[PDB]
Write an enzyme that holds these catalytic residues in place. Structure first.
Site, PDB file in Angstrom:
ATOM      1  N   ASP A  75      -4.220  -8.126  -0.744  1.00 17.88           N
ATOM      2  CA  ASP A  75      -4.242  -8.981   0.432  1.00 17.88           C
ATOM      3  C   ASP A  75      -4.941  -8.362   1.639  1.00 17.88           C
ATOM      4  O   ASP A  75      -5.041  -8.992   2.690  1.00 17.88           O
ATOM      5  CB  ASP A  75      -2.850  -9.493   0.793  1.00 17.88           C
ATOM      6  N   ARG A  76      -5.415  -7.132   1.486  1.00 16.74           N
ATOM      7  CA  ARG A  76      -6.197  -6.458   2.525  1.00 16.74           C
ATOM      8  C   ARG A  76      -7.482  -5.932   1.934  1.00 16.74           C
ATOM      9  O   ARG A  76      -7.509  -5.476   0.785  1.00 16.74           O
ATOM     10  CB  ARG A  76      -5.435  -5.286   3.114  1.00 16.74           C
ATOM     11  N   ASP A  92      -6.455  -2.909  -0.854  1.00 13.31           N
ATOM     12  CA  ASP A  92      -5.157  -2.259  -0.884  1.00 13.31           C
ATOM     13  C   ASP A  92      -4.473  -2.574  -2.214  1.00 13.31           C
ATOM     14  O   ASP A  92      -5.034  -3.292  -3.052  1.00 13.31           O
ATOM     15  CB  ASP A  92      -4.292  -2.589   0.347  1.00 13.31           C
ATOM     16  N   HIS A 146       0.811  -1.234   0.000  1.00  8.97           N
ATOM     17  CA  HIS A 146       0.000   0.000   0.000  1.00  8.97           C
ATOM     18  C   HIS A 146       0.842   1.283   0.000  1.00  8.97           C
ATOM     19  O   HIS A 146       0.293   2.403   0.098  1.00  8.97           O
ATOM     20  CB  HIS A 146      -0.870   0.041   1.253  1.00  8.97           C
ATOM     21  N   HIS A 165      -5.722  -7.795   6.863  1.00  2.00           N
ATOM     22  CA  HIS A 165      -5.317  -9.095   6.340  1.00  2.00           C
ATOM     23  C   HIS A 165      -6.188 -10.137   7.030  1.00  2.00           C
ATOM     24  O   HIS A 165      -6.199 -10.213   8.269  1.00  2.00           O
ATOM     25  CB  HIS A 165      -3.818  -9.393   6.603  1.00  2.00           C
TER      26      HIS A 165
HETATM   27  O1  LIG Z   1       2.177  -2.532  12.997  1.00  2.64           O
HETATM   28  P1  LIG Z   1       3.201  -2.851  11.947  1.00  2.64           P
HETATM   29  O2  LIG Z   1       4.315  -3.730  12.444  1.00  2.64           O
HETATM   30  O3  LIG Z   1       3.744  -1.579  11.363  1.00  2.64           O
HETATM   31  O4  LIG Z   1       2.533  -3.700  10.772  1.00  2.64           O
HETATM   32  C1  LIG Z   1       1.263  -3.227  10.250  1.00  2.64           C
HETATM   33  C2  LIG Z   1       0.974  -4.007   8.970  1.00  2.64           C
HETATM   34  O5  LIG Z   1       2.071  -3.813   8.100  1.00  2.64           O
HETATM   35  C3  LIG Z   1       1.849  -4.449   6.795  1.00  2.64           C
HETATM   36  O6  LIG Z   1       0.645  -3.949   6.214  1.00  2.64           O
HETATM   37  C4  LIG Z   1       1.746  -5.953   6.941  1.00  2.64           C
HETATM   38  O7  LIG Z   1       1.427  -6.571   5.643  1.00  2.64           O
HETATM   39  C5  LIG Z   1       0.609  -6.297   7.915  1.00  2.64           C
HETATM   40  O8  LIG Z   1       0.631  -7.700   8.084  1.00  2.64           O
HETATM   41  C6  LIG Z   1       0.794  -5.521   9.244  1.00  2.64           C
HETATM   42  O9  LIG Z   1      -0.346  -5.721  10.010  1.00  2.64           O
HETATM   43 ZN   LIG Z   2      -1.271  -5.561   0.841  1.00  9.17          ZN
END
Ligand SMILES: O=P(O)(O)OC[C@H]1O[C@H](O)[C@H](O)[C@@H](O)[C@@H]1O
Ligand SMILES: [Zn+2]
Length: 455
Positions: free
Chosen positions: A238-239, A234, A101, A321
């Site tokens: 995947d989201r 996104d 994203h 996700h």
């Molecule tokens: O809270 P963070 O460690 O920054 O990660 C927040 C998000 O980052 C990305 O989008 C990953 O694909 C997600 O799996 C995760 O939930």
């Molecule tokens: Zn994504």
């Protein structure tokens, strides 16, 4: 190569700066070497709709080829479609070239080797292979694989909508536009497309449905067209983000309530995973339906590992996700999750606003971020884990510190994608919310009186 692109969950960098064509080649060499070390010569490769996709994917593929790997090139697809390839082809390794994203110039790699999504030390092990020249050499091959029609059919054939719905679909000019509007229509919907042309310049809003601002257009269109539901994807698919027929944003932890009820109804006792950012209400709801709630770390690859360890049939995280194993393969997939949601909603005579409003709700904060430094964030958390006092509550330190109180909860943890502390708070009343916030404010100040406490 720069160390900073080797992250906890994936590889991610800025093209022209920390991620170049040559870096993609050597990353392919490292991945192919690890895949071969695990007995898997077959590796699927996909890319999203970013501008740097063509340049970097050719290098990634050559790096794999130069190990002696057999590459299945699926072209431009959503991330979950690459994960799908790595589950249904004979080979169980796969690499997705995506910046998720992030802004247009970002790109990166999500990596599955012999069935396992790499994280943490395994991602570092790739960096280390390149530094050490601990790399395979061989004469591999590339085959074209057109996988999207199989994916489309697999979903369509297992989803049974009970009545038609009108759905606005916002792809944010990301790659979800190659399938989502088409598939949702095929399920038995009318689809109003928003920003469904693939365009790596992201000339409209960035494809990031976690921010309310990127749902403004979706919400307005739902209202204007009297649609039953809005969905936003996104950049890599995947989201998913969800909006009701009245424009209410349904955050992923409450979406998970509906999905957990669905999955557990057919699977008594099933484990259901959620991350430390999710509402405590989801925990009681899973238990009430006879499921086994399993709280775990934030991060897609960490969640996938935990699903393998527990046999969980469903997982989700607050970032959107959502991971179905029941009737599916266990990976995160916004498109498939959207289909599963439409299935459930179509079987209910009520509108989507009332389906979701039926579940208990608490007062919760927008995710809070405090910028620290990359090289201190983990130590601040360690200091809290060693030193802090939280009063009476159930303390969880599997990812930062979360404390669950009778009437609410709080969390502080280090982001693994940015140099920040992430906090969330939720409570039954404003009074309790403020009490919990004060506990956390004071514990942060006890570790370092100079830390910002902008909440
Ligand atoms: O809270 P963070 O460690 O920054 O990660 C927040 C998000 O980052 C990305 O989008 C990953 O694909 C997600 O799996 C995760 O939930
Ligand atoms: Zn994504």
């Amino acid at each position: 190569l720069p160390a900073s692109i080797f992250r906890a969950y994936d590889i991610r960098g800025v093209v022209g700066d920390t991620l170049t064509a040559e870096t993609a080649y050597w990353i392919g060499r490292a991945i192919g070497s690890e895949s071969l070390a695990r007995g898997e010569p077959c590796v699927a490769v996909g890319r999203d709709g970013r501008l740097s996709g063509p340049e970097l994917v050719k290098q990634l593929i050559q790096g794999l080829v130069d190990c002696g790997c057999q590459v299945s090139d699926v072209g431009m697809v959503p991330t979950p479609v690459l994960y799908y390839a790595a589950n249904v082809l004979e080979g169980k390794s796969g690499v997705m070239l995506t910046g998720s994203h992030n802004p247009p110039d970002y790109n990166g790699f999500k990596i599955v080797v012999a069935g396992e999504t790499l994280a943490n030390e395994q991602i570092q092990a790739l960096r280390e292979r390149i530094e050490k020249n601990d790399l395979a050499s061989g004469v591999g091959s590339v085959e074209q694989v057109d996988i999207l029609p199989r994916y489309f059919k697999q979903i369509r054939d297992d989803i049974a909508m009970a009545k038609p719905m009108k759905v606005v679909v916002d792809c944010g000019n990301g790659v979800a536009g190659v399938i989502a509007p088409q598939l949702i229509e095929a399920l038995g919907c009318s689809v109003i497309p928003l920003y469904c042309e693939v365009d790596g310049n992201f000339p409209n809003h960035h494809p990031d449905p976690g921010k309310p601002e990127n749902l403004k257009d979706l919400i307005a269109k739902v209202k204007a067209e009297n649609a039953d539901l809005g969905l936003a994807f996104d950049g890599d698919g995947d989201r998913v983000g969800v909006v009701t027929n009245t424009g209410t944003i349904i955050y992923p932890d409450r979406l998970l309530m509906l999905f957990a009820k669905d999955v557990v109804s057919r699977n008594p006792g099933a484990d259901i995973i959620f991350d430390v950012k999710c509402t405590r209400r989801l925990i009681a709801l899973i238990s009430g339906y006879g499921g086994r709630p399993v709280m775990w770390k934030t991060g897609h690859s960490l969640i996938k590992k935990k699903m393998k360890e527990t046999g969980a049939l469903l997982a989700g995280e607050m970032s959107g996700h959502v991971f179905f194993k029941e009737r599916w393969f266990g990976f995160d997939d916004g498109i498939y999750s959207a289909a599963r949601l439409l299935e459930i909603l179509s079987q209910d005579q009520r509108d989507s606003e009332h389906v979701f409003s039926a579940f208990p709700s608490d007062i919760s904060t927008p995710e809070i971020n405090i910028t620290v430094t990359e090289d201190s964030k983990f130590a601040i958390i360690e200091a809290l884990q060693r030193d802090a006092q939280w009063g009476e509550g159930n303390i969880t330190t599997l990812d930062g510190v979360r404390v669950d109180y009778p009437k609410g909860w709080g969390l502080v943890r280090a982001s693994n994608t940015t140099p920040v502390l992430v906090l969330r708070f939720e409570a039954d009343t404003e009074e309790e919310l403020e009490r919990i916030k004060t506990v956390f404010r004071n514990q942060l100040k006890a570790v370092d009186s100079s830390l910002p406490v902008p909440f």
